[PDB]
Design a protein around this ligand. Structure first.
Ligand code: SF4
Ligand code: MG
Ligand code: MG
Ligand code: MG
Ligand code: MG
Ligand code: MG
Ligand code: MG
Ligand code: MG
Ligand code: MG
Ligand code: MG
Ligand code: MG
Ligand code: MG
Ligand code: MG
Ligand code: MG
Ligand code: MG
Ligand code: MG
Ligand code: MG
Ligand code: MG
Ligand code: MG
Ligand code: MG
Ligand code: MG
Ligand code: MG
Ligand code: MG
Ligand code: MG
Ligand code: MG
Ligand code: MG
Ligand code: MG
Ligand code: MG
Ligand code: MG
Ligand code: MG
Ligand code: MG
Ligand code: MG
Ligand code: MG
Ligand code: MG
Ligand code: MG
Ligand code: MG
Ligand code: MG
Ligand code: MG
Ligand code: MG
Ligand code: MG
Ligand code: MG
Ligand code: MG
Ligand code: MG
Ligand code: MG
Ligand code: MG
Ligand code: MG
Ligand code: MG
Ligand code: MG
Ligand code: MG
Ligand code: MG
Ligand code: MG
Ligand code: MG
Ligand code: MG
Ligand code: MG
Ligand code: MG
Ligand code: MG
Ligand code: MG
Ligand code: MG
Ligand code: MG
Ligand code: MG
Ligand code: MG
Ligand code: MG
Ligand code: MG
Ligand code: MG
Ligand code: MG
Ligand code: MG
Ligand code: MG
Ligand code: MG
Ligand code: MG
Ligand code: MG
Ligand code: MG
Ligand code: MG
Ligand code: MG
Ligand code: MG
Ligand code: MG
Ligand code: MG
Ligand code: MG
Ligand code: MG
Ligand code: MG
Lengths: 138, 99, 82, 208, 137, 148, 122
RNA sequence: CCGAGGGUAGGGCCCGUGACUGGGGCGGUCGUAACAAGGUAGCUGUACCGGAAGGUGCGGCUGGA
RNA sequence: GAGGAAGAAGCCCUUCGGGGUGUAAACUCCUGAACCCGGGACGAAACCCCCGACGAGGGGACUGACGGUACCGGGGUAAUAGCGCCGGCCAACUCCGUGCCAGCAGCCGCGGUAAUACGGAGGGCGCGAGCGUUACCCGGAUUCACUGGGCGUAAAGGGCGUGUAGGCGGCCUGGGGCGUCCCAUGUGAAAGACCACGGCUCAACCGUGGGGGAGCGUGGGAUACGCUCAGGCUAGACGG
RNA sequence: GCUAGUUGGUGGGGUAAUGGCCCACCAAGGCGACGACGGGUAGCCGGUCUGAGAGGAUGGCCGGCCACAGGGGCACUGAG
């Protein structure tokens, strides 16, 4: 997708400095963009449309189920953690094949803690959480 | 020109003012047929000389009160209390168009 | 005050005025009082000016003042010749 | 842009030699001679009874494919016709024919309209000694359809000008050869031109 | 009787479709004036100012085509079509440029005017208009 | 001779113990394109016969149709019971602006330019019989004057 | 009706009823997936059709159809919808536009890809 | 004096929502009311009764005999 | 772009002979989008300075964002094609895969082992820098019917009267001229739409001229129909 | 069904100016099935789109009028 690069800023100890260019081998912050997320290559318009090497590693280590209590406001969460997932790309929402509960998965206790604590104290969510249900058999 | 119009006095129960009912005719813009319609004009009678029945001409004049914007021009005909009933019997009839 | 000036028409890079009489406080290209002839600053056709000199006098008389380049194409076709 | 693809197939579908290829059209090596059935896997299949829409559809593509032109431009010409005075179908062929690139072909400067269009788009033609490259230039009665005189020393105008010293440009045209010029004198009459086209079937089409 | 005219054209219509040699219609000056047109225009043979039980009528003489060949020997009609246009229910009034053109020429519109009871050809040349009274063909 | 166009082929069906038994019917218009037309509708136990039969009845029943530079004299409205054909006359540039049933019955009589419309039941068979009886109701300034 | 009756009582104009009230007038609307299941269609038919219950940014919660062979949809899938009754299915009256939001296009599609949001193969 | 508006109090309309409940639409269990004189001609307004269709009284209709 | 086989390869079909894509490709050759160089604008002649008189006329000077862009001149490489459909409506047909599954679907309806209706393929049809889809407006809808519909049984005569307003209203003569018709006149801005010409190479775009109408104001005129007023009639109606 | 500044009047204030615009008094009026009052929706027009037309639909860009300047009220200065 095409995207306008309005302004370019360097962040100093105490102030924000505007700068008209940012050469290669350097870091800075560009103002203007709209769709770009983290780990996304960015090329000048008339250039080879190369995709930088991505990144890639660890799969989440801890798993916690979240129950949308009641019930027409499950989906306050549905749009909440879609805003989240492009904000943090390390948690992982999933819904269980059997049992049908929603299963946020994480990088650790702490990671799930704030993500959860946010989900409520920032999105109100009528919801509680705990041990995932087990898919049994006869 | 100051619009002149012709009609019957239906109320003189005011004070230096008479109500002049005015018919006009025109064709229905979709269905051709000629139709009548009407309008009551509050009309200035400074010398109180006009009365029930008196078909008169009234003329577009400068404002005299809220809703009086015509003064009577000339007495044209007299005693047309048939038209006066033609309008009371319609008014009166209203008392049975309620619920 | 009431004025004689160029009311642009035409299109982009195709100027096509319409020297005109209108109240000073209109849009340039808004409701004018009278059209007294066109003007084609680019000179694309034999008629790139035809001031109705009969009219253009009547105005100047009763008040109307004009652009420092309204008169330019008003003098050019002489509304001023003694 | 234009049709650009396999062009015999046009003719094979249409059941009529449209003389699109120009130089080859008269050869026994044309396609319409060896196989005059429709293109593709199903031509030698005993054809089926054609609907009225079809009949006018086929008739229309026929006319259209002849002048080798975009259905957009075709329709817009056609609309101009209906609104213009008198007989639509005629005035259609008129305006269809009053267009440049096809003139150049009528005046044999080039072999086919395709080849003609190229010539026109390339600046190798000029109306009135003003250089004109737009293949949709509606030519009006009185115009001098020159060849660009800096395009004069060029193997292909020659070749085609050379086979055009005393053939007959239709009643409305006037090829002063040698000097490379020619002229657009009259917008055609209906009788002025025969194409394998029912001028009326096409009007009945755009009436749906 | 509500529309004397419609009545007459319908006296006349009903008449012809069973080929009555004549039919009588109660009389008025205005009524005559239209008949006077029907005649003059080849629609009826014409008419005379008769009298029934002392009542002033008009006798309209009807007019047809030849006997025909085939299993329906009834003649074609001279007035094929006749119907009121303007009406007590709905007045029709046309100005001169508004004037209709019946059967691509072959028929007429008789139309009252402040200059007589004319036909369409007539008023169009006289430069007037009025009440579209009917149409015949 | 004349030109034929089959306008409507259709299978019907009738009932009888153990089986529905068919019979086909065909409506055909026939015309010279210079002034005569005709129409007949015929029904055999086999398609192609009934088409031919429709033809037989086609020529057995024809129509005047007084052309006029390829249009008709007056505008005409006919109803064949619930179905209703309307013909209007059109200037020499137009074309046949009609249905499919009236398209044929007008093209074969050699109508070159017409405005029409099918109010009422747009049933083919009655729209047919309707278009005809409206043609055979066309007259001219002549026969009018002749009659008056 | 007499000409008077028409003068008096006029003629009643016809008004039309939206078949996509859920869109609130928009071309398409966005939503989230609350349930994703299959459903069975009425006589004379008999498949297991892939549906989604979808809560729109309009307020409405509607059930929508998932066109194609297979999908990637499940609970919390963000999705874009368009007008489109599916005839056999009680209460389905919009479609998920493949190739948008979390709607995967169709693997291996060759024809009409415009309509199953599949990009052009190399 | 008037006065944005604040406040007290009583009303009218609209919209959303509510344990529960009423029928309506869409996708097995009981009987057989209607369609053939449909096995008691059918339908009817009303009325009483009955798991249910419906039955019955009184009058009407033929769109029945 | 021109030429280029009784017609390559691959692929699709096949009664196994052949058929199709297809002059399409390759191939010869001709042109030469982009690019490269060279030049390079119209839009700007007034304000002001000079003679005159700070006026009329005359003459002189400065000023260009777009822009080194348009366009011109010279050189100059074969150089993006995609999308919808192909049961009927509706233009376009075969083979496999599948087997009420997977799916299609605007309406009919299609899928249960031989599917032109699903999926792929070859072929075909239509459009082409677009092609389709959803939303909506008018159209087909003469299906709110003025143009231009209807009510015994299809939806539709009020259970029946009596009557209010209203709508409608017989034959003759006359006055008015309200409706209605006619001529004049003012208004009906510009853009638009329409016809003509003309500027940009064409067109889109745009400029100049022409033609105006409904509608309303004002004056003149007509009188048949409708209106109102005035007399007469007896065929409607009431009465004896 | 509506209506007490309600409808009319005498006098006066206000204004560039007519007026219940505002005020004091007198009168008892004014409006309504030709749809008042009330509820809904909407800036209007030149025009635009569709239509054989009649009609339907629409009012973004441009031109004309109106209304608004976060929500309200208010006056000052001024030719405005
Ligand atoms: S050559 Fe024969 S086949 Fe090819 S176009 Fe000319 S005419 Fe048609
Ligand atoms: Mg997402
Ligand atoms: Mg007063
Ligand atoms: Mg300046
Ligand atoms: Mg060269
Ligand atoms: Mg069309
Ligand atoms: Mg059409
Ligand atoms: Mg027969
Ligand atoms: Mg009928
Ligand atoms: Mg039908
Ligand atoms: Mg049918
Ligand atoms: Mg004859
Ligand atoms: Mg089944
Ligand atoms: Mg099925
Ligand atoms: Mg997800
Ligand atoms: Mg208060
Ligand atoms: Mg308060
Ligand atoms: Mg407060
Ligand atoms: Mg409630
Ligand atoms: Mg039973
Ligand atoms: Mg029984
Ligand atoms: Mg029983
Ligand atoms: Mg029975
Ligand atoms: Mg009973
Ligand atoms: Mg029991
Ligand atoms: Mg019982
Ligand atoms: Mg009984
Ligand atoms: Mg029976
Ligand atoms: Mg061979
Ligand atoms: Mg091969
Ligand atoms: Mg081979
Ligand atoms: Mg080639
Ligand atoms: Mg070269
Ligand atoms: Mg310059
Ligand atoms: Mg000096
Ligand atoms: Mg350069
Ligand atoms: Mg060059
Ligand atoms: Mg090549
Ligand atoms: Mg298509
Ligand atoms: Mg089509
Ligand atoms: Mg077909
Ligand atoms: Mg096989
Ligand atoms: Mg399977
Ligand atoms: Mg498909
Ligand atoms: Mg198969
Ligand atoms: Mg089968
Ligand atoms: Mg298929
Ligand atoms: Mg299909
Ligand atoms: Mg519609
Ligand atoms: Mg309509
Ligand atoms: Mg409807
Ligand atoms: Mg009607
Ligand atoms: Mg009907
Ligand atoms: Mg019934
Ligand atoms: Mg009755
Ligand atoms: Mg009752
Ligand atoms: Mg009465
Ligand atoms: Mg009378
Ligand atoms: Mg009367
Ligand atoms: Mg008059
Ligand atoms: Mg205008
Ligand atoms: Mg030109
Ligand atoms: Mg103009
Ligand atoms: Mg009398
Ligand atoms: Mg007071
Ligand atoms: Mg006073
Ligand atoms: Mg005063
Ligand atoms: Mg007040
Ligand atoms: Mg006062
Ligand atoms: Mg009092
Ligand atoms: Mg009124
Ligand atoms: Mg509101
Ligand atoms: Mg609003
Ligand atoms: Mg229509
Ligand atoms: Mg505007
Ligand atoms: Mg405000
Ligand atoms: Mg404010
Ligand atoms: Mg704001
Ligand atoms: Mg404020």
């Amino acid at each position: 997708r095409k995207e306008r690069v309005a302004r370019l800023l360097r962040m100093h100890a105490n102030h924000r400095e505007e700068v008209e260019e940012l050469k290669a081998g350097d870091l800075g912050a560009v103002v203007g963009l709209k769709e770009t997320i983290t780990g996304d290559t960015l090329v000048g318009e008339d250039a080879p449309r190369v995709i930088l090497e991505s990144i890639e590693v660890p799969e989440p280590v801890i798993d916690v189920a979240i129950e949308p209590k009641t019930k027409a406001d499950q989906e306050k969460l549905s749009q909440a953690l879609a805003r989240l997932a492009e904000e943090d790309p390390t948690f992982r929402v999933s819904t269980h094949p059997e049992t049908g509960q929603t299963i946020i998965s994480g990088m650790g206790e702490l990671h799930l803690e704030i993500i959860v604590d946010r989900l409520k104290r920032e999105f109100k969510v009528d919801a509680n959480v705990g041990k995932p249900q087990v898919a049994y058999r006869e | 020109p100051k619009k002149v119009l012709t009609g019957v006095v239906v109320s003189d129960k005011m004070q230096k003012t008479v109500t002049v009912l005015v018919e006009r005719q025109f064709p229905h813009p979709l269905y051709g047929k000629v139709i009548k319609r009407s309008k009551k004009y509050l009309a200035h009678d400074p010398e109180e000389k006009y009365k029930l029945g008196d078909v008169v001409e009234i003329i577009e004049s400068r404002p005299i009160s809220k809703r009086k914007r015509f003064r009577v021009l000339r007495l044209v005909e007299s005693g047309r209390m048939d038209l006066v009933e033609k309008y009371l019997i319609r008014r009166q009839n209203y008392e049975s168009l309620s619920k | 005050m009431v004025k004689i000036r160029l009311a642009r028409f035409g299109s982009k890079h195709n100027p096509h005025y319409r020297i005109v009489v209108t109240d000073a406080r209109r849009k340039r290209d808004g409701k004018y009082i009278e059209k007294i002839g066109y003007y084609d600053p680019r000179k694309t056709t034999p008629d790139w000016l035809k001031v109705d000199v009969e009219r253009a006098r009547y105005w100047l008389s009763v008040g109307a003042q004009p652009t420092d380049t309204a008169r330019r194409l008003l003098r050019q076709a002489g509304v001023f010749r003694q | 842009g234009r049709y650009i693809g396999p062009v015999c197939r046009l003719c094979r579908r249409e059941g009529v030699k449209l003389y699109l290829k120009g130089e080859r059209c008269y050869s026994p090596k044309c396609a319409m001679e060896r196989r005059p059935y429709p293109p593709g896997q199903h031509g030698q299949k005993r054809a089926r009874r054609p609907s009225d829409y079809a009949v006018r559809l086929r008739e229309k593509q026929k006319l259209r494919r002849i002048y080798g032109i975009s259905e957009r431009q075709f329709r817009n010409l056609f609309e101009e016709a209906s609104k213009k005075k008198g007989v639509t179908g005629s005035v259609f062929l008129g305006l269809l024919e009053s267009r440049l690139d096809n003139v150049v072909y009528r005046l044999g400067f080039a072999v086919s309209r395709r080849q003609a269009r190229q010539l026109v788009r390339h600046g190798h033609i000029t109306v009135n000694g003003r250089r004109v490259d737009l293949p949709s230039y509606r030519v009006r009665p009185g115009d001098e359809i020159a060849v660009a005189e800096k395009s004069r020393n060029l193997e292909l105008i020659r070749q085609n000008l050379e086979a055009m010293k005393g053939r007959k440009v239709g009643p409305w045209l006037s090829l002063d050869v040698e000097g490379m010029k020619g002229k657009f004198l009259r917008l055609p009459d209906r009788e002025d031109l025969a194409l394998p086209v029912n001028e009326q079937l096409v009007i009945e089409f755009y009436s749906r | 009787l509500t529309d004397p005219i419609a009545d007459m054209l319908t006296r006349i219509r009903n008449a012809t479709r069973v080929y009555k040699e004549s039919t009588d219609v109660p009389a008025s000056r205005f009524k005559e004036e239209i008949l006077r047109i029907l005649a003059r225009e080849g629609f009826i043979k014409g008419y005379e100012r008769v009298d029934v039980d002392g009542k002033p009528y008009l006798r309209v003489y009807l007019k047809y085509g030849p006997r025909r060949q085939g299993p329906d020997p009834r003649p074609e009609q001279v007035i094929h079509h006749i119907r009121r246009i303007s009406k007590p229910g709905r007045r029709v009034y046309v100005g001169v440029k508004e004037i209709p053109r019946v059967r691509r020429g072959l028929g007429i519109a008789i139309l009252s005017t402040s200059k007589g009871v004319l036909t369409d050809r007539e008023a169009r040349k006289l430069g007037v208009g009025g009440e579209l009274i009917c149409e015949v063909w | 001779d004349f030109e034929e166009k089959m306008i409507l082929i259709r299978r019907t069906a009738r009932m009888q113990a153990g089986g529905r038994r068919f019979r086909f019917g065909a409506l055909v218009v026939v015309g010279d394109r210079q002034g005569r037309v005709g129409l007949g509708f015929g029904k055999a136990p086999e398609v192609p016969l009934a088409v031919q039969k429709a033809g037989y009845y086609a020529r057995r029943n024809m129509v005047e149709v007084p052309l006029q530079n390829g249009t008709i004299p007056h505008e005409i409205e006919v109803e064949f019971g619930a179905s209703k054909i309307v013909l209007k006359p059109a200037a020499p540039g137009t074309g046949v602006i009609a249905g499919a049933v009236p398209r044929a019955i007008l093209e074969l009589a050699g109508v070159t330019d017409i405005l029409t419309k099918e109010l009422g039941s747009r049933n083919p068979i009655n729209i047919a019989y309707a278009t005809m009886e409206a043609l055979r109701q066309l007259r001219t300034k002549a026969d009018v004057e002749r009659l008056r | 009706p007499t000409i008077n009756q028409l003068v008096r009582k006029g003629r009643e104009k016809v008004r039309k009823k939206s078949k996509v009230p859920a869109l609130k007038g928009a071309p398409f609307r966005r939503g989230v997936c609350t349930v994703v299941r299959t459903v069975t269609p009425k006589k004379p038919n008999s498949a297991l059709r892939k549906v989604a219950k979808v809560r729109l940014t309009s307020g409405y919660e509607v059930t929508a159809y998932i066109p194609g062979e297979g999908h990637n949809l499940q609970e919390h899938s963000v999705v874009l919808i368009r007008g489109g009754r599916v005839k056999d299915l009680p209460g389905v009256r919009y479609h998920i536009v493949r190739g948008v939001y979390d709607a995967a296009g169709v693997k291996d599609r060759k024809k009409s890809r415009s309509k199953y949001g599949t990009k052009k193969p190399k």
